[PDB]
Amino acid sequence: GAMVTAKKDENFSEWYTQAIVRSEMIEYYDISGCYIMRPWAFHIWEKVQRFFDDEIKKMGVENSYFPMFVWVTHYGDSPLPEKIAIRPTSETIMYPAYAKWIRSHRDLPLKLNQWCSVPTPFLRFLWQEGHTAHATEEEAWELVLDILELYRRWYEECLAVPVIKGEKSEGEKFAGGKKTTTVEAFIPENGRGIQAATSHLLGTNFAKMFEIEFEDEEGHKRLVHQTSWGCTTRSLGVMIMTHGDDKGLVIPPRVASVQVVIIPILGEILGKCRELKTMLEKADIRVRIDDRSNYTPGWKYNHWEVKGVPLRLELGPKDLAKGTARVVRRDTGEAYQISWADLAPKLLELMEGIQRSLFEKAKARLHEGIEKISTFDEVMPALNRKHLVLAPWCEDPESEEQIKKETQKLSEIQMTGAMKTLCIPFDQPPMPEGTKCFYTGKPAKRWTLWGRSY
Amino acid sequence: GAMVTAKKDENFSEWYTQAIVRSEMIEYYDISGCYIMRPWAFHIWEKVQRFFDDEIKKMGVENSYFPMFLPEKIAIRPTSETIMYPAYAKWIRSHRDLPLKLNQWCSVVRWEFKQPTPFLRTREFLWQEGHTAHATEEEAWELVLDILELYRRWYEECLAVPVIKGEKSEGEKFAGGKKTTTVEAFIPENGRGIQAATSHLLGTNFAKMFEIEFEDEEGHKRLVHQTSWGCTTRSLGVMIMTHGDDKGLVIPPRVASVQVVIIPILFKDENTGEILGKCRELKTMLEKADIRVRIDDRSNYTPGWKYNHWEVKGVPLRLELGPKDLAKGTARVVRRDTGEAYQISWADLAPKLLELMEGIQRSLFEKAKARLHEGIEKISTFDEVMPALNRKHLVLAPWCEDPESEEQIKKETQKLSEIQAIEAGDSEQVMTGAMKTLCIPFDQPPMPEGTKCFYTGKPAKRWTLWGRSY
Predict the structure, then answer these.
(1) Fold of B253-358
(2) Which of A28, A297, B78, B86 has the CA that lies 20 to 30 A from B41?
(3) CATH second-level architecture of A370-453?
(4) Contacts of A101 in chain B (CB under 8 A)
(5) In which region does residue B342 sit, left (phi positive, over 0), alpha (psi from -120 to 50) or beta (all else)?
């Protein structure tokens, strides 16, 4: 009787917990935080993993395994045993091997990636990270933007979660990198931004510290231009929060463990159900026939609705007589009495329509969750409406810290509560000439998306 | 210009180290032995992983992830059973919940062994492990045998390494389970058997231990019949030892990262662009046939350097194209396994190369199978053991399957090993000289009535494969 009792707009954290637990997605035990990823979510992880892996195989990225863990001048001209102690990161492990392997320009580009594995689930796990080294900065930037587009496709085309491409501020970018691109998603229930995925342009900063030098065509020793990117299982959690409802989970059909479940209504109907399942499995459709004995049909309805199957198929005596089956979708309560012959094509059409509907509704909520302001006195109401803000900014690093401190102090009205830079979006609205910064008053530079975040 | 200098049948350990390092499929990181797995070997691991995963997904096995707070290479780590089987008991409630089939692909790196061997005896490896629970013992045993057949296909159809299916002795099986099946491989250069993969019939012991019960159709609470299996990157190591030669590695074309390497022959600054463009269009043509191709147009190295480089890396086929071959409209394809050269027209390149590839794979398999057949001696009495062991061979003997007799034989063969005091001008890795049961093979040779045990003299039960092991 796994039935979600908490309401999504009321008790959001308890709703998330009940949704991820009751749907047989994860399983806790007594120690704090640790959980087990049951197949219901690991199938989604696999699907997105296969997508990203094939797409980076096309780009020439090769997978590998490095033994990874669990300031300017000194870290750089110090030996590797001390470099590991100072910064025990994946860069300190990988980039010495990069310096050993890279010697000639014909050794570039070097593209490596690894899928690694080692509170609240799916927020703070499995992930992937990749590192590249190129001969020029233009090639590095091209690869960074390609990976960011791959992340946009990961979130929007697979999980139906709309993300905003942008550039991180000087305070939120990678510490040693030159520039950091990102994609951002929005959770309306708490009105908070979240970093969906990240992609960094490291440049020659790390090549300086590890002496990752190469000889070009003219025989000149030049530094490589490195990039690094990564994406975690957070994509699952976001995908859980943007589509679920009070009934439970709603999983987009492109990543569903089982896309359509066939429920009998209670002799020959079981054979006809198996025939329909064999017919549907041929057309790429993932089918599971829930032929439980004692469980009532409504119990199975609630079970598969909590699990979040996009479509469920009912076949009863009247359905067997009139020649049609009763399919019902999960995002909305729309039902369809459809013939057995036209089952597979119209079912996959319904699946694509459900995916597009989920993405479009999430994009509409995203657009409704952003307020384009101009002066600072609008930030506190906009934040109190569970919304993000898009304001003109001069991109002064001190101003960001000042705004965060003041917005945290302006939390008199009873995680955190401060407002930080989500990103400087690539899609920049037009900036009038004399436009001033929304906080300092200096000449503004670009439109920056701010808001509360995870 | 990294060449493999050690002879494979003279300095086997040095040969293995040179072969894995100079082929750019491994990179040692520090003094402890910690190493990086480079894409040249990770591609083979990805191929075998894709095969096994697609095959077990047809069996209804679903992938999952469990963290960390005989099973082959796992004499370390915090155990998988104590983490999984509590959740298994919490999940399984009725026969409707069965059968349960889970699997996970994992990787680990711990403090390295004393005198380690990467992709073999090492505390750093990638692997997969699966666990199942069934209502009956028959279904569980059938799944065990299906997984063992999948392992046989993993080693033979993918890596071209012949293996022997069998069951472990009472003293060499998973002590917690009921019966432990296995596949065994043979290394002739040191004459040692090795456990390629394992599949266990755990039975109801862990069901009792973790209270994993279920209600049947009538209502009685019964125990589940559990199985578990696993396979590591050790396969790669075996695939390295089985097909490698004095020149370096020989990778079967099915799992090769690069199947055909194109080497344009360019002398002087004349007719270079035409040859390069022709090599590029040939690469595109071959890629249109699902052939993995790569062109080595590096000018700082001569053709001989490239030959040795891609021979050490183990590319099964290389394609030479000079200006004379540009004129004749043909190319010279050299195979890595035997070295035989062929002259093939451009229109025949893709079909003849797909054919050469299959031929090299089958030959790679058949030669190793012949070596395996030649490394096993069928004996009848115990005084035949130490000779056959000194010939770096295994033995197939009739045995009564007495547990204490196996320990007696281990101690006796260790006492009779001798020569444990002369290392000449070439010291290698010293392993134990005792002989133990590798497996009781499924393919049992016929047993004539009245056959006595080769050691105890008691009535012999079955043919058992003994030998020195890893």
Answers:
(1) Rossmann fold (3.40.50)
(2) B78
(3) 2-Layer Sandwich (3.30)
(4) 27
(5) beta
